[PDB]
Amino acid sequence: KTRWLNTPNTYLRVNVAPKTTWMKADEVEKSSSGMPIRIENPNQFVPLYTDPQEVLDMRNKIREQNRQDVKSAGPQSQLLASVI
Amino acid sequence: DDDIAALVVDNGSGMCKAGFAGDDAPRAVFPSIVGRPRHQGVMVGMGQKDSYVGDEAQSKRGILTLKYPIEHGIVTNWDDMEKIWHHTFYNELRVAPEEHPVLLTEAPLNPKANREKMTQIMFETFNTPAMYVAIQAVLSLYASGRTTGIVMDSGDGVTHTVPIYEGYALPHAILRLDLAGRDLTDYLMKILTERGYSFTTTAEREIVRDIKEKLCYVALDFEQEMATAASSSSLEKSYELPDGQVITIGNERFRCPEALFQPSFLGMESCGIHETTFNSIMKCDVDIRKDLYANTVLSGGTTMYPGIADRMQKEITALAPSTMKIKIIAPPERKYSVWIGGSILASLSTFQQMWISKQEYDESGPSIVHRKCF
Amino acid sequence: LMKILTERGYSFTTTAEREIVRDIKEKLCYVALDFEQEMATAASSSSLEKSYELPDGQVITIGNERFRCPEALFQPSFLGMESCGIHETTFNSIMKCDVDIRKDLYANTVLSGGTTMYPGIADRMQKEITALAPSTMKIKIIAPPERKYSVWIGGSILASLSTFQQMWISKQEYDESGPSIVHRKCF
Amino acid sequence: DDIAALVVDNGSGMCKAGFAGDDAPRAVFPSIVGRPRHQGVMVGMGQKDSYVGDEAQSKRGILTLKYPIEHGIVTNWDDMEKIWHHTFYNELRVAPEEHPVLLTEAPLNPKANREKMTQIMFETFNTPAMYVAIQAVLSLYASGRTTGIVMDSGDGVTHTVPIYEGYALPHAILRLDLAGRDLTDYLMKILTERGYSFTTTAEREIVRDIKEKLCYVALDFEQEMATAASSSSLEKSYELPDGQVITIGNERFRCPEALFQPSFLGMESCGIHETTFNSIMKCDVDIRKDLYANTVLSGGTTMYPGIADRMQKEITALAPSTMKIKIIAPPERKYSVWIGGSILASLSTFQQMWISKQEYDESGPSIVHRKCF
Amino acid sequence: DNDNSSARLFERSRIKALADEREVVQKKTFTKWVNSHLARVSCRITDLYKDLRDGRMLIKLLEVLSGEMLPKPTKGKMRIHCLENVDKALQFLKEQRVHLENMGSHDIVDGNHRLVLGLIWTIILRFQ
Amino acid sequence: AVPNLFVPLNTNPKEVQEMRNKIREQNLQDIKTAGPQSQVLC
Amino acid sequence: AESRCREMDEQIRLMDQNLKCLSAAEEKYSQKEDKYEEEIKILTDKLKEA
Amino acid sequence: AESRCREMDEQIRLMDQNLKCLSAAEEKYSQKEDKYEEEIKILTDKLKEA
Ligand SMILES: Nc1ncnc2c1ncn2[C@@H]1O[C@H](COP(=O)(O)OP(=O)(O)O)[C@@H](O)[C@H]1O
Ligand SMILES: Nc1ncnc2c1ncn2[C@@H]1O[C@H](COP(=O)(O)OP(=O)(O)O)[C@@H](O)[C@H]1O
Ligand SMILES: Nc1ncnc2c1ncn2[C@@H]1O[C@H](COP(=O)(O)OP(=O)(O)O)[C@@H](O)[C@H]1O
């Protein structure tokens, strides 16, 4: 039914010294030992409704641009676009 | 207002690869080494570099002590690893880290502190909007394009076998072996000692790694190959040092990678990679085994020696029952295959709902990585 | 236990390491009365931590894994096996018998073997088998303090009976009948 | 019983030789070969092409000293033949055809060294049987225990090997090219700071005598720097052969400290204590507490006063605190290898393990890898 | 050999072409931005890699962007004077807590393309 | 054959322990001894 | 010039080898498919007669 | 040296393009194999029960 995933440590939220910060909270400060994560059903990582053809179609689309050897470059930031 | 393509960053031990999502091949490939000077600087007016990072550090190997931030797939120096990540983001890809999502890879059986520290140092320092951690072998099988197979990824640092049947991965059948390229480099140094050549410094360890990459192969029959090497001197090759000195290897060409199949040379008592794959297959259920015998996938740089596929097919056929067909799938560009799969997983429209958001991180802490990703 | 000890960072791979891990299991393990409550208790504080000293001299703190290793006895889905736990196994074994003899079978449940020496195994076993059993029936578990050797003790009883002298397979009988004498002679 | 065997230890610095079953070697002499360099004018004094061993030490003024063994490797085989002939005929006065010989060499060496040694000891001296052994295993014989890690430091090379219950782990053997000759060269380098200059090969022996007489290992390095800077109580005076007087002072504990910090020589490698600790950690878990209790020092380089306390303190610092570290240094640890050789050479069960002459004839010089180790 | 030959052909085709094509366009956009800011002091750069070797253009660009006086460059045409000028510029970037990795004076002087592009991108992103 | 190729098996350690003590006895007792004299000399 | 000449000679060699292996793989590959085709037709006949 | 390296450049550029198509061809054959085997095996099973 339920599968348990253990974490040997515990992180504590600490205010900025705004940006969120998390803290180790080592064992000298009497922190909690084992943090449990419960999974009550299989295949929770994958969405339930999915067409199998889509992944293979996109694999073909990506791969044959090597075959046709494109001149495409990566995205550019907009701070460069503004000065133009 | 189109969504910007994510960044795919593959980090095994000993090499870092990075590129944009939706592209065929990564933009940047560079070794994951960091060096620091050891000698005294006497010329005034020189540049003040505390640490040489990445490929640049391999240019001036003579005056640095090279170190690796990852040992056996475990990041043992986080502040050092931050330098590789910063150099990747700002100098090679030169992209703003706050503007794109980042996808990362790791080994199967790792301490949870590795994943938690990766998530914490990615959100807190580089200030990414979203991130995800994906297992490498699943990405490689994505790159192969089949929805069912067993994949054995052997890279510098680690070797691991996972099976997948119809999109389901059995967790108890995952096997992990700490026999990798760095151990083979050390064994190559040890056996090159008795020929008459001595290498001690890490700068010479890089040279030994280059010799291993350039001149090695795997023999189909080990005893016959040793007898042939003893009878005649035809199996001999020459190499030139950066100093400039012709050395001749001879017998040691096919003995360095043979330690992959017989780990007793190193003193380790573990089984070979062929028996590791066989034991992973036999741990699975019966009705899938035939399919797992027909879809063996090799991945990683360590599987790039010539003759690995034929030797592994012969050995598995010697172990498997005779009535089944054993096929070994080895793409020519398999060394990059893991990264390629990541790009596909970064380009699916279905995947876009499963990025770990910054907002949910703010209330779930760095422990959301165990709940969200596999 | 060796697989789940990998998650904390400690690694054990050879045969001597398996012997060391078995010693760790024999020293520091127990079965929780309630899995959810004990897991939340370990989530609250750090009172469920023990330190074991390796033969190398290193000290490890196993902590949460003390009651997760024996819990595979009651929930074999951790290992991926299809079969369910020991308590419903003996419940099905009882249910395969006749209705008239079940009353004696509930009151005479005896535990034996090395694995059944985990602390708190009797209370958890009794609670689970009472949850499975009908409410009108009474449950009695029998846990000998020397259960680990009890089988051998039974053998010492069987070799002392005077009628048992008739049970022995003679050497002449074996020479006459081949190795297949044991099926017909031994029940 | 029959004829006794010969035990010969050929380190890089000095050669030792004796009969098996004896307590101490008969012949101990430096492994040098000297040849003259000046003009010879006195007619009728006779000629002498080479000076071998101790004879070259007394007349070292007019010779160029050369070492046949360099870093544990035999570079010039002709001088090795000369040394072996001198050992057999002038030092022990025995015919080599009647006696078997047992030889010693380093753990990690090129194959051609062993092959050529076997070919030389069979082809020219016509010995009936011979054998090759690792020096540190013989040290473990000399100690008399079945379990321990042994660290041997000679004039050519330093090596650590652990052995448990008679089984030696091959992957845990560590070799380091830091020895007494490198320390002698470093002493020659740091004696320049006070004004004394030694250049030729004759003065290298004077520097070696200075190092053997007036050097010691500091327990705490920085505290000794503070003490030597504060006062002049650490200075000692030595007399040169020509009659001049030198005074070392600070350099007494800086030359042997370089073993523990090889960065003084420019070497990247770790110290001897870290090498021993790493070689221990390369072993398995169950034998480590036995290796902590049986560390054995061997070789002449470990004859500095105060080496044992420094080694014990360093390894205690590196190891976990719950176990005890003891370092076993016998007072006669210079000749330990040779003593071990004797203990090996006349065992009753060892007599079946000699490499026979017929076996060499029918197998070539390649038989030494199949036997020995 | 055939698998290795095809694999390294895949590298030297795709990896090399993508990286080199990206750096060409990125260099053109960067040099246009730098010429845009450097019109105020009446200096301009034709090539990004060659003109930054002397280091006076970098000092002038930091003078433009920060609006405050830097130390004067040493009037020397030696190699070490070029290293001195580039070190002065990098030090001026160093006091104001702009983070740099793998940045050295000789990296700019010898003309490393990725390092120069990274320095220009860092100046664009973190200063303006 | 590969683990113990180099040594013969089933040997008592007491023999080696006896021989080390026998050699140490000469050191304790300070024995005069000469080397074996050759047959051709005789 | 001499360095980039060494580069491009290596290019010649590598992709010559790749042409070798690829054409040989195709030419050996064609024979097997015909054997599968003949087997299917003969197999059907054995089914229908039974 | 410069001119000879430039002259050899066109040859590498053109017969690299020659290599590219043959790659996809052998990939197509590798695809064609498998479904031929599976139709063989199902036909054999049906024949057996016949
Ligand atoms: N062409 C090659 N032939 C043989 N071995 C190689 C080759 N390329 C890389 N290797 C080995 O593979 C290792 C690199 O593995 P890699 O796949 O980069 O690991 P990761 O990608 O997980 O960091 C190197 O240590 C090297 O020893
Ligand atoms: N005191 C104990 N606590 C926990 N487990 C134990 C204890 N004693 C034994 N075991 C487990 O039981 C096993 C021994 O079982 P045992 O009854 O001896 O098997 P058998 O007698 O059938 O061979 C050991 O491997 C150990 O794992
Ligand atoms: N009493 C001593 N004190 C300090 N160092 C010594 C002493 N005796 C010898 N040494 C050093 O040891 C070297 C000789 O070591 P030795 O045992 O002869 O090596 P090997 O026998 O392996 O050649 C000398 O060069 C010297 O540097």
Chain centre to alpha carbon of residue D106: 9
Q: How many CB atoms lie within 10 A of CB A77?
A: 17
Which chain E residue has its CA at the smallest distance from B83's CA? E101
Alpha helices of chain D — where are they, by DSSP H?
A: 54-58, 77-86, 111-123, 135-143, 180-190, 201-213, 221-230, 272-281, 288-292, 307-318, 336-345, 357-363, 367-370
Using alpha carbons only, what angle is made at residue B92 by residues B90 and B94, rounded to the nearest 5 degrees?
40
Experimental determination technique: cryo-EM
D364 token code pair: 């070539």
Q: How far apart are the first and last CA of chain E?
A: 51
Looking only at the bridges linking them, the beta strands covering D129-134 and D355-356 are: antiparallel
Using alpha carbons only, what angle is made at residue D279 by residues D276 and D285, rounded to the nearest 5 degrees?
120
Q: Please give the torsion angle defined by the CA atoms of residues D160, D162, D167 and D172, in that order, rounded to the nearest 10 degrees.
A: -70
In sign, the C-alpha dihedral spanning C100, C104, C105, C106 is: positive
Whether residue C61 has its Cβ less than 6 Å from ligand 2: no
Look up the CATH number of domain C1-73: 3.90.640.10
Whether residue D202 has its Cβ less than 6 Å from ligand 3: no
Looking only at the bridges linking them, the beta strands covering D101-105 and B15-20 are: unpaired
Sheet strands (E) in C62-159:
109-110, 141-142
Q: Report the C-alpha gap between D255 and D183 in whole angstroms.
A: 6
Binary contact (G8, H12; C-beta < 8 A): yes
Binary contact (G21, E9; C-beta < 8 A): no
Among candidate residues D136, D84, D88, the one with its CA nearest the CA of residue D108: D136
Ligand 2 pocket, mutate which of C148, C150, C152 (most atoms under 8 A from CB):
C148
| Element (DSSP H or E) covering residue C93 | helix C86-95
Inter-CA distances, C155 with B336, C112, C149, C159, C164, Å: 64, 14, 10, 6, 11
Single-letter residue type at D94: V
The answer, yes or no, to whether H and G have at least 3 beta-carbon pairs within 8 Å is: yes
Q: Please give the torsion angle defined by the CA atoms of residues B226, B230, B235 and B239, in that order, rounded to the nearest 10 degrees.
A: 100
- The DSSP bridge partners found for residue B53 are B34
Q: Are B13 and B136 in contact (CB under 8 A)?
A: no
Q: Are D149 and D294 in contact (CB under 8 A)?
A: yes
Which chain E residue has its CA at the smallest distance from A69's CA? E14
Q: Spell out the CATH class of D180-259.
A: alpha beta
Q: Are D330 and D143 in contact (CB under 8 A)?
A: yes
D209 token code pair: 């005598």
Whether residue B69 has its Cβ less than 6 Å from ligand 1: no
Look up the CATH number of domain B181-260: 3.90.640.10
Q: Report the C-alpha gap between D56 and D65 in whole angstroms.
A: 8
Q: Are B204 and D269 in contact (CB under 8 A)?
A: no
Whether residue C117 has its Cβ less than 6 Å from ligand 2: yes
DSSP string, B159-221: EEEEEEETTEE-STT-EEE---HHHHHHHHHHHHHHHT----SHHHHHHHHHHHHHS----SS
HSE-up (13 A, CA, CB side) for residue C27: 12
3-class SS of residue B138: helix
Q: Report the C-alpha gap between D166 and C58 in whole angstroms.
A: 26
Among candidate residues D111, D134, D270, D367, the one with its CA nearest the CA of residue B191: D111
Q: Report the C-alpha gap between B54 and B84 in whole angstroms.
A: 7
3-class SS of residue E75: coil
Ligand nearest, relative to CA of residue C155: 2
HSE-up (13 A, CA, CB side) for residue G24: 7
Single-letter residue type at B306: P
DSSP state of B14: T
3-class SS of residue E102: coil
Q: Are B370 and B112 in contact (CB under 8 A)?
A: yes
Ligand 1 pocket, mutate which of B106, B156, B214 (most atoms under 8 A from CB):
B156
Looking only at the bridges linking them, the beta strands covering B158-165 and B175-177 are: antiparallel
Q: Report the C-alpha gap between E105 and E84 in whole angstroms.
A: 8
Inter-CA distances, B370 with B112, B131, B271, C7, Å: 8, 13, 31, 12
The full length of chain C comes to 187
Distance between C57 CA and the closest CA of chain D, angstroms = 6
3-class SS of residue D213: helix
Q: Report the C-alpha gap between B275 and B315 in whole angstroms.
A: 9
Chains that touch C (3 or more CB pairs under 8 A): A, B, D
The answer, yes or no, to whether B and C have at least 3 beta-carbon pairs within 8 Å is: yes
DSSP state of A29: G
Whether residue B15 has its Cβ less than 6 Å from ligand 1: yes
3-class SS of residue B134: strand
Closest atom of ligand 3 to CA, residue D300: 17
Inter-CA distances, H4 with F22, H1, H13, Å: 83, 5, 15
CA of B300 to the centre of ligand 1 (A): 7
- The DSSP bridge partners found for residue D132 are D103
Whether residue B341 has its Cβ less than 6 Å from ligand 1: no
Q: Report the C-alpha gap between G25 and C27 in whole angstroms.
A: 62
Q: Are B321 and B359 in contact (CB under 8 A)?
A: no
Which chain C residue has its CA at the smallest distance from A26's CA? C46
Single-letter residue type at C7: E
> Residue holding tokens 């004067």?
E72
Q: Are B132 and B101 in contact (CB under 8 A)?
A: yes
Binary contact (A8, B23; C-beta < 8 A): no
Q: How far apart are the first and last CA of chain H?
A: 75
HSE-up (13 A, CA, CB side) for residue E49: 11
DSSP string, D272-291: HHHHHHHHHHTS-STTHHHH
